[PDB]
Design an enzyme around this catalytic site. Structure first.
Site, PDB file in Angstrom:
ATOM      1  N   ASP A  44      -2.389  23.017 -18.471  1.00  0.00           N
ATOM      2  CA  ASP A  44      -2.637  24.275 -17.766  1.00  0.00           C
ATOM      3  C   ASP A  44      -2.719  25.403 -18.767  1.00  0.00           C
ATOM      4  OD1 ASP A  44      -2.748  25.733 -15.069  1.00  0.00           O
ATOM      5  OD2 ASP A  44      -1.299  26.886 -16.265  1.00  0.00           O
ATOM      6  N   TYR A  49      -2.993  34.048 -21.662  1.00  0.00           N
ATOM      7  CA  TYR A  49      -1.885  33.536 -22.418  1.00  0.00           C
ATOM      8  C   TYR A  49      -2.066  33.708 -23.921  1.00  0.00           C
ATOM      9  CZ  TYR A  49      -0.729  31.293 -17.939  1.00  0.00           C
ATOM     10  OH  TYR A  49      -0.512  31.000 -16.595  1.00  0.00           O
ATOM     11  N   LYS A  78      -8.094  29.736 -16.291  1.00  0.00           N
ATOM     12  CA  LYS A  78      -8.055  30.756 -15.282  1.00  0.00           C
ATOM     13  C   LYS A  78      -8.806  32.003 -15.737  1.00  0.00           C
ATOM     14  CE  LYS A  78      -3.348  29.164 -14.399  1.00  0.00           C
ATOM     15  NZ  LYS A  78      -2.822  29.037 -15.773  1.00  0.00           N
ATOM     16  N   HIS A 111      -7.223  33.733 -11.428  1.00  0.00           N
ATOM     17  CA  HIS A 111      -5.807  33.731 -11.818  1.00  0.00           C
ATOM     18  C   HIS A 111      -4.930  34.499 -10.831  1.00  0.00           C
ATOM     19  CE1 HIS A 111      -3.208  33.594 -15.699  1.00  0.00           C
ATOM     20  NE2 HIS A 111      -2.420  33.518 -14.628  1.00  0.00           N
TER      21      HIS A 111
HETATM   22  N1  NAP Z   1      -1.000  30.889 -12.157  1.00  0.00           N
HETATM   23  C1  NAP Z   1      -0.054  31.766 -12.539  1.00  0.00           C
HETATM   24  O1  NAP Z   1      -0.029  32.938 -12.198  1.00  0.00           O
HETATM   25  C2  NAP Z   1       1.072  31.210 -13.354  1.00  0.00           C
HETATM   26  C3  NAP Z   1       2.255  31.946 -13.466  1.00  0.00           C
HETATM   27  C4  NAP Z   1       3.338  31.413 -14.127  1.00  0.00           C
HETATM   28  C5  NAP Z   1       3.240  30.156 -14.722  1.00  0.00           C
HETATM   29  N2  NAP Z   1       2.028  29.485 -14.688  1.00  0.00           N
HETATM   30  C6  NAP Z   1       1.841  28.161 -15.389  1.00  0.00           C
HETATM   31  O2  NAP Z   1       2.967  27.367 -15.075  1.00  0.00           O
HETATM   32  C7  NAP Z   1       3.608  26.942 -16.335  1.00  0.00           C
HETATM   33  C8  NAP Z   1       5.051  26.668 -16.096  1.00  0.00           C
HETATM   34  O3  NAP Z   1       5.763  27.875 -15.678  1.00  0.00           O
HETATM   35  P1  NAP Z   1       6.633  28.760 -16.682  1.00  0.00           P
HETATM   36  O4  NAP Z   1       6.112  28.679 -18.066  1.00  0.00           O
HETATM   37  O5  NAP Z   1       6.704  30.116 -16.032  1.00  0.00           O
HETATM   38  O6  NAP Z   1       8.084  28.178 -16.623  1.00  0.00           O
HETATM   39  P2  NAP Z   1       8.827  26.740 -16.405  1.00  0.00           P
HETATM   40  O7  NAP Z   1       7.898  25.647 -16.698  1.00  0.00           O
HETATM   41  O8  NAP Z   1       9.490  26.830 -15.079  1.00  0.00           O
HETATM   42  O9  NAP Z   1       9.986  26.892 -17.474  1.00  0.00           O
HETATM   43  C9  NAP Z   1       9.661  26.897 -18.888  1.00  0.00           C
HETATM   44  C10 NAP Z   1      10.984  27.078 -19.601  1.00  0.00           C
HETATM   45  O10 NAP Z   1      11.827  25.948 -19.365  1.00  0.00           O
HETATM   46  C11 NAP Z   1      12.264  25.361 -20.590  1.00  0.00           C
HETATM   47  N3  NAP Z   1      12.356  23.937 -20.416  1.00  0.00           N
HETATM   48  C12 NAP Z   1      11.288  23.067 -20.301  1.00  0.00           C
HETATM   49  N4  NAP Z   1      11.672  21.829 -20.146  1.00  0.00           N
HETATM   50  C13 NAP Z   1      13.054  21.886 -20.138  1.00  0.00           C
HETATM   51  C14 NAP Z   1      13.998  20.867 -20.032  1.00  0.00           C
HETATM   52  N5  NAP Z   1      13.676  19.574 -19.885  1.00  0.00           N
HETATM   53  N6  NAP Z   1      15.306  21.256 -20.089  1.00  0.00           N
HETATM   54  C15 NAP Z   1      15.603  22.575 -20.262  1.00  0.00           C
HETATM   55  N7  NAP Z   1      14.747  23.605 -20.378  1.00  0.00           N
HETATM   56  C16 NAP Z   1      13.460  23.193 -20.303  1.00  0.00           C
HETATM   57  C17 NAP Z   1      11.245  25.820 -21.632  1.00  0.00           C
HETATM   58  O11 NAP Z   1      11.842  25.872 -22.894  1.00  0.00           O
HETATM   59  P3  NAP Z   1      11.098  25.379 -24.257  1.00  0.00           P
HETATM   60  O12 NAP Z   1       9.629  25.648 -24.103  1.00  0.00           O
HETATM   61  O13 NAP Z   1      11.830  26.225 -25.291  1.00  0.00           O
HETATM   62  O14 NAP Z   1      11.408  23.901 -24.400  1.00  0.00           O
HETATM   63  C18 NAP Z   1      10.872  27.206 -21.133  1.00  0.00           C
HETATM   64  O15 NAP Z   1      11.839  28.171 -21.554  1.00  0.00           O
HETATM   65  C19 NAP Z   1       3.254  28.077 -17.274  1.00  0.00           C
HETATM   66  O16 NAP Z   1       3.495  27.797 -18.623  1.00  0.00           O
HETATM   67  C20 NAP Z   1       1.802  28.315 -16.916  1.00  0.00           C
HETATM   68  O17 NAP Z   1       1.028  27.262 -17.502  1.00  0.00           O
HETATM   69  C21 NAP Z   1       0.972  29.988 -13.992  1.00  0.00           C
HETATM   70  O1  388 Z   2       0.302  35.487 -14.597  1.00  0.00           O
HETATM   71  C1  388 Z   2       0.747  34.504 -15.199  1.00  0.00           C
HETATM   72  O2  388 Z   2       0.150  33.394 -15.361  1.00  0.00           O
HETATM   73  C2  388 Z   2       2.135  34.586 -15.794  1.00  0.00           C
HETATM   74  O3  388 Z   2       2.546  35.927 -15.920  1.00  0.00           O
HETATM   75  C3  388 Z   2       1.953  36.716 -16.865  1.00  0.00           C
HETATM   76  C4  388 Z   2       1.418  36.188 -18.021  1.00  0.00           C
HETATM   77  C5  388 Z   2       0.904  37.061 -18.994  1.00  0.00           C
HETATM   78 CL1  388 Z   2       0.250  36.383 -20.417  1.00  0.00          CL
HETATM   79  C6  388 Z   2       0.923  38.428 -18.812  1.00  0.00           C
HETATM   80  C7  388 Z   2       1.465  38.912 -17.625  1.00  0.00           C
HETATM   81  C8  388 Z   2       1.941  38.092 -16.628  1.00  0.00           C
HETATM   82  C9  388 Z   2       2.470  38.739 -15.386  1.00  0.00           C
HETATM   83  O4  388 Z   2       2.976  39.830 -15.368  1.00  0.00           O
HETATM   84  N1  388 Z   2       2.157  38.065 -14.260  1.00  0.00           N
HETATM   85  C10 388 Z   2       2.459  38.651 -12.965  1.00  0.00           C
HETATM   86  C11 388 Z   2       1.322  39.302 -12.251  1.00  0.00           C
HETATM   87  C12 388 Z   2       0.057  39.504 -12.842  1.00  0.00           C
HETATM   88  C13 388 Z   2      -0.961  40.070 -12.089  1.00  0.00           C
HETATM   89  C14 388 Z   2      -0.738  40.434 -10.782  1.00  0.00           C
HETATM   90 BR1  388 Z   2      -2.082  41.140  -9.698  1.00  0.00          BR
HETATM   91  C15 388 Z   2       0.483  40.258 -10.161  1.00  0.00           C
HETATM   92  C16 388 Z   2       1.487  39.701 -10.929  1.00  0.00           C
HETATM   93  F1  388 Z   2       2.663  39.478 -10.356  1.00  0.00           F
END
Ligand code: NAP
Ligand code: 388
Ligand code: BR
Length: 312
Positions: A44, A49, A78, A111
């Site tokens: 993803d 990012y 995205k 996104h």
């Molecule tokens: N579409 C959107 O708006 C949106 C928004 C948010 C997220 N996303 C996507 O979703 C992905 C995942 O969400 P996220 O990055 O917010 O957070 P997450 O996956 O819920 O949590 C990541 C955190 O958990 C830690 N971690 C990972 N595996 C672990 C384990 N086995 N034990 C303990 N800690 C662990 C990581 O540490 P380390 O990396 O230090 O190991 C990092 O600090 C994102 O990276 C992004 O690709 C999309």
């Molecule tokens: O949006 C993501 O994927 C994760 O969150 C972020 C990542 C980056 Cl690199 C920068 C900022 C955010 C971040 O702030 N995301 C939250 C967000 C964004 C836009 C809108 Br309309 C609402 C909202 F809640």
């Protein structure tokens, strides 16, 4: 558990992927290489990012090494909010493709529903700190996404952070050509999303759960906030199954027919997080995890809350 879910474009999507938000550019290449070596086939990504080039180095090296074939990978990115405009969508997609060094994406998402003023800044602000909108609407942005399918740049299109009404708006779009394949939304035991998930699933849209571990590295974390990984109730379920809390948190959405995309740059955790196909949570475990909902969101942003299409 079967490793892939069928999308409404006829393609299969791996239910486990590697997240890359916050993965430092000097660490994410190795993270993705390790992920592919240990079995991940879904990454993803997003332009916002700021690390797609480095993700792409890893993908390309593993393709070159013939660790995997391109057809076996499922790469997601995205469209950022500053590119909702008709004349900007293709170039945004193409920049992502060139950074990832791909000739197509498996899935390309809007996104966030909100469009912002185009320019260099990802969050253009007025002098009082409100995001500056675009007068683009989600339907016209969707038509631009459909164009990408018809040009061969992407195999599937979808949405992210769209609420029920916004998904419905797309599904009701006059002249809709391609339904969204996916809605990628925040989902974990503190934000269980039962209503939106049921809506999307009923419409044949696959839901991807982001922040499944509660994004402990989110830059806006505050002391006070709840912590999934430290919740003794979830740790108890993990102990019962002889798994880690993270493994439970990843298996949970899998059993709800969701795709899940935990992020890590730690090689041992990347591997641990993949070892989730050999145990089952009981129905009672599932309902117990669901019971922890508190409508707590990682991802929300005050500067955007007055945008007409802010989803929450
Ligand atoms: N579409 C959107 O708006 C949106 C928004 C948010 C997220 N996303 C996507 O979703 C992905 C995942 O969400 P996220 O990055 O917010 O957070 P997450 O996956 O819920 O949590 C990541 C955190 O958990 C830690 N971690 C990972 N595996 C672990 C384990 N086995 N034990 C303990 N800690 C662990 C990581 O540490 P380390 O990396 O230090 O190991 C990092 O600090 C994102 O990276 C992004 O690709 C999309
Ligand atoms: O949006 C993501 O994927 C994760 O969150 C972020 C990542 C980056 Cl690199 C920068 C900022 C955010 C971040 O702030 N995301 C939250 C967000 C964004 C836009 C809108 Br309309 C609402 C909202 F809640
Ligand atoms: Br938004």
């Amino acid at each position: 558990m079967a490793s892939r879910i069928l999308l409404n474009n006829g393609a299969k999507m791996p239910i486990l992927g590697l997240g890359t938000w916050k993965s430092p550019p000097g660490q994410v290449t190795e993270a993705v290489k390790v992920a592919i070596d240990v079995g991940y086939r879904h990454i993803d990504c997003a332009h916002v990012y700021q690390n797609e080039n480095e993700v792409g180095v890893a993908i390309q090296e593993k393709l070159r090494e013939q660790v995997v074939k391109r057809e076996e990978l499922f790469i997601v990115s995205k469209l950022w909010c500053t590119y909702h405009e008709k004349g900007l969508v293709k170039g945004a997609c193409q920049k992502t493709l060139s950074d990832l060094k791909l000739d197509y994406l498996d899935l390309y998402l809007i996104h966030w529903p909100s469009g912002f003023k185009p320019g260099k800044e990802f969050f253009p602000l007025d002098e009082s700190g409100n995001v500056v909108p675009s007068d683009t609407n989600i339907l016209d942005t969707w038509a631009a996404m459909e164009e990408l399918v018809d040009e061969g740049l992407v195999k599937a299109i979808g949405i992210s952070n769209f609420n029920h009404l916004q998904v419905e708006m797309i599904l009701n779009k006059p002249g809709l050509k391609y339904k969204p394949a996916v809605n990628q939304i925040e989902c974990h035991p503190y934000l269980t999303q039962e209503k939106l998930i049921q809506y999307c699933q009923s419409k044949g849209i696959v839901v991807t759960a982001y922040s499944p571990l509660g994004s402990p590295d989110r830059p806006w974390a505050k002391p006070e906030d709840p912590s999934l990984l430290e919740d003794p109730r979830i740790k108890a379920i993990a102990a019962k199954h002889n798994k880690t809390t993270a493994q439970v948190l990843i298996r949970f959405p899998m059993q709800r027919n969701l795709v899940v995309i935990p992020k890590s740059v730690t090689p041992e955790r990347i591997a641990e997080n993949f070892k989730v196909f050999d145990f089952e949570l009981s129905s009672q475990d599932m309902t117990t995890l669901l019971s922890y909902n508190r409508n707590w969101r990682v991802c929300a942003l005050l500067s955007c809350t007055s945008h007409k299409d802010y989803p929450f």
